[model samples]
Target: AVDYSEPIIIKEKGEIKVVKIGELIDEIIKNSKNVRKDGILEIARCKDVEVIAFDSNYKFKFMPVSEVSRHPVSEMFEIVVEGNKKVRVTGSHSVFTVKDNEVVPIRVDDLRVGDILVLAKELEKLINSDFIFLKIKKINKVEPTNGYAYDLTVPNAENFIAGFGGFVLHN
Candidate 1:
């Protein structure tokens, strides 16, 4: 059993500690046992302090449990990922295209092969300048892995997503 004495503080969104969420984290931690990963973890109430980055607060302590198996349990120790907004293309340079004449919005992950996409900056630079469309070609998302990426037929095909204000869509 490994003792991870350090406690991680994160935001929770409920009134009590949800055991399912804790179990999910345990499964995730077990599956990704080799490398380090980082992201938001959600929960209900937990024995912790306060913060405004989320609704409630949780303090996660990953300590070893059970003398029989000596198994390390992530029971709320290794826990939780929000939301409904239209895919906003404002201030974006590489916004993918939708089916022609479609009115509703689409999630980035929902995009499929052969779906059309538009490079906003490239559209503005072309001679006709009406719109620039590219077939999705392929979407290489490594399922259940920490791989979030897209494949487009535009220049700087690798630099579409950004961490901050570098110009990309948010949904």
Candidate 2:
């Protein structure tokens, strides 16, 4: 088990939430003190670590991990908070796709719903540039979980890409 600090209480936008992430299972721990308070209290584990909600009638409700977007070199995921909020995880790398017969690179931070993309590998169709692109349905605040080093969200695209359209930046 990875040693973790105490559950931290966060009061944001008038909501009180005490949160914790256990040493294993990638579980975010929410203490019962926050879970029982009626607004959004932390809850103890009944069975599954993924359980996010507890009610008298409904019992423990689980929110599955959102689907992850992937590229040959990058990926993206989201963690949904039960009360209609979500946190996105944009992996350390991004992807490429063919668009308008050109190898277009995309950055995860710049994607939005309804954008299209062609897989990066497809670009080898080299003369090579092909017409392919994945249509992005959405893009919000998320970033690489590389945990190697922290850097500002720069205008650079060294380590990631999104399906949304944009110019390629060289490091």
Candidate 3:
């Protein structure tokens, strides 16, 4: 049996426990031993991605979704990190707003090698502005490990059939 005993809480003593959303899901999936090595998942920008930046008051802003336009890279998926909305701390009576920076990155990890790790990566490129990934870019070979696609990559895959709930589709 797994333990959820170590409840997530930001201590008043200023001690904080944190984990990347991606890492969290990864660990959970790993622990469950239901993870597939390399599977294909096609994620598309069903709509525009939104992020509030979380300076305060759950501000909503026009996040970025590269997959919406299928830009130069011919994107097939997108991700957005809303970060902190509001949560009641363990044993705490009042609900506090956790800042965006305070929230550990979360990700959807059930997809196979062909699956799209949408939420974080797309946001990373958009928010971080470090590098924009597109499918149109010239590539030698496509590999699932790199988190990108290849020529043989699932083309025009609409809704990503997630096992968790149902088919995820974008408009």
Candidate 4:
């Protein structure tokens, strides 16, 4: 097997949700206790973190970040508080795909967030791991859907679009 190093990993779980832009900010501040709660914050160039949220159909909503005063403007995300003290939100992917299918039109609508929990096995392995930078060398579109997903590669960017079509809200 080959060796690997540190990389941004995507962790998703829980139910899907869609809330208003205003609600998202309010919750993060009021409920999140100034982002000191169990969740994420986007950081840039040593500045406070900012986030980007999209519309129901992945349209540009707005850009916002953590500051000493207020939240991002016009951005929104589907979120929830679970029994396990975990929350979930949609985010960008280095790659996105639907496993085992043909290339055709597809849409994504639902998104969830979860806690960042490093397993004991993973932690043990990581503790002794060495650093070796390795680029993907390829951004090939090789999934059955072949449809593209959100991949925001911007500095100080943490907000990501997570919904498209064919994705329905369920109870």
Give me the candidate number with maximum lDDT: 2
Candidates ranked, most accurate by lDDT first: 2, 1, 4, 3
lDDT of every model, 2 decimals? 0.26, 0.29, 0.22, 0.24
Give the poorly placed runs of model 1, Cα more than 4 Å off. 1-96, 102-104, 123-131, 143-168
Task: Count backbone overlaps in model 1.
Answer: 2
| Residues 35-121, model 2: lDDT tens digits | 222322222322222212212221222322211111121334432222222333333324344456554555545544555543222
TM-score of 3: 0.18
Q: What TM-score, over all chains together, does every model reach?
A: 0.26, 0.25, 0.18, 0.20
Residue 15, model 2: Cα distance from true site in angstroms? 51
- Compose the digit string of candidate 4's lDDT tens values, residues 139-165: 222221112111222233333332221
- Identify the superior model by lDDT, candidate 2 or candidate 3: 2
Q: In candidate 4, which residue ranges exceed 4 Å CA deviation? A: 1-13, 35-159, 162-171
- In candidate 3, which residue ranges exceed 4 Å CA deviation? 1-16, 36-39, 42-171
What overall lDDT, based on C-alpha atoms, would model 4 receive against the true structure?
0.24
TM-score, prediction 2? 0.25
Task: Report the alpha-carbon TM-score of model 1 versus the true structure.
Answer: 0.26
Residues 1-171 of candidate 1: C-alpha lDDT, one tens digit per residue: 111221222233422222222232344345443423323321122222221111011111222211110122222111000011112221212333444443123445455556554332221223233333445444432221111111111121222221111112222
Which segments of candidate 2 are over 4 A away from where they belong? 1-94, 120-132, 140-171
By TM-score rank, best first, the candidates go 1, 2, 4, 3
- Tens-digit lDDT string for candidate 3 (60-147): 2223222311111222222221321111111111111113423222222222122222221223323442111211111122112223
Of candidate 3, the 10-residue stretch with the lowest lDDT total is 86-95
